[PDB]
Amino acid sequence: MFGLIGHLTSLEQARDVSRRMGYDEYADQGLEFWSSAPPQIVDEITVTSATGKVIHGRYIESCFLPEMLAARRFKTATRKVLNAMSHAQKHGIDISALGGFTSIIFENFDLASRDTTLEFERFTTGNTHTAYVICRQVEAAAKTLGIDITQATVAVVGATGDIGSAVCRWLDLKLGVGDLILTARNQERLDNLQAELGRGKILPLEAALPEADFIVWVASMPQGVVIDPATLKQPCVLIDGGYPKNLGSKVQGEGIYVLNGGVVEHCFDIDWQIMSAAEMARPERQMFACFAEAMLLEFEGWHTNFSWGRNQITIEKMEAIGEASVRHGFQPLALAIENL
């Protein structure tokens, strides 16, 4: 049994999903309502691999709301995630993914540090897979645009994050990228990253972007961030790989292509109503890679926290989850040539 732990996206979207959760669609549901709403298993899921193997999952609604952050209700926000995790476990789910804010939250509040104790091998961030997909997207994109990745330049914004640092290890060792630009907030970690890599030019954001054929956006987007279309190279690909994805609407311009990063398309229809179904071109087949990771671990029978902590993702783990991804019928989302 795999699990997909997710969360609401706005107060209005929660009222949409409200009824299906046993609640009154037209009642007063305030931030305080969803703060006290308990976690619920909400959707039963049956995925069928390309090999023929059938697996079963549960989508667990955590009721976390990004407004709980906005209202500085960080302990309430922490609680939602941990409850959701604890709910997964009591119902005997073997491996669950924390999608969207869920894992960001689990990290920035060191939640590794209720009734019973949580088994962490029962959960995964799905980040190893997310990093793997993001890298297949760079590779794919470069082939599509006629760009030798061996000569090209990739800026990894957030290169010190769990996802970002995994992307750099792969872009270096696997694609053999030409120039790798590192970008992040913490100078110390940027130094330690480039030391492990043996390469990479550390740069501030507004020097990074204009060198880059590919930009891998994988960090908490700062406030007052000016992305000026006009400074970017004229064939440019921006891979929005973090949660939430907002580049699609904050960056627009001729020869600029924004691509949802870390998204996968399955080979067969899946019947569900998940967390970002509304932002997927093809909801019945498209999902976050971190969720798909949870599925790959259950297809393979690897019941462990395959992805966990910060900067632990290794090339070898990325390799293993990658070919599990392919074998079971998952393709990276790709550029859609309606690019005019």
From Swiss-Prot:
Query: What are the EC numbers?
Result: 1.2.1.80
Q: Where are the transmembrane segments?
A: none
Instruction: Tell me the SUPFAM superfamilies matching this sequence.
Output: NAD(P)-binding Rossmann-fold domains
What cofactors does the UniProt entry give for this protein?
a divalent metal cation
Q: Name one GO molecular function term.
A: oxidoreductase activity
Catalytic activity of the protein:
a long-chain fatty aldehyde + holo-[ACP] + NADP(+) = a long-chain fatty acyl-[ACP] + NADPH + H(+); a long-chain fatty aldehyde + holo-[ACP] + NAD(+) = a long-chain fatty acyl-[ACP] + NADH + H(+)
Keywords of this protein's UniProt record, alphabetized? NAD, Oxidoreductase
Q: Which InterPro entries match?
A: AAR, NAD(P)-bd_dom_sf
Record family assignment: Belongs to the short-chain dehydrogenases/reductases (SDR) family.
Name the job this protein performs: Catalyzes the NADP-dependent reduction of long-chain acyl-ACP to the corresponding fatty aldehyde. Involved in the biosynthesis of alkanes, mainly heptadecane and pentadecane, by producing the fatty aldehydes used by aldehyde decarbonylase.
Protein's recorded name:
Long-chain acyl-[acyl-carrier-protein] reductase
> Which organism is this protein's natural source?
Synechococcus elongatus (strain ATCC 33912 / PCC 7942 / FACHB-805) (Anacystis nidulans R2)
Source taxonomy lineage?
Bacteria, Bacillati, Cyanobacteriota, Cyanophyceae, Synechococcales
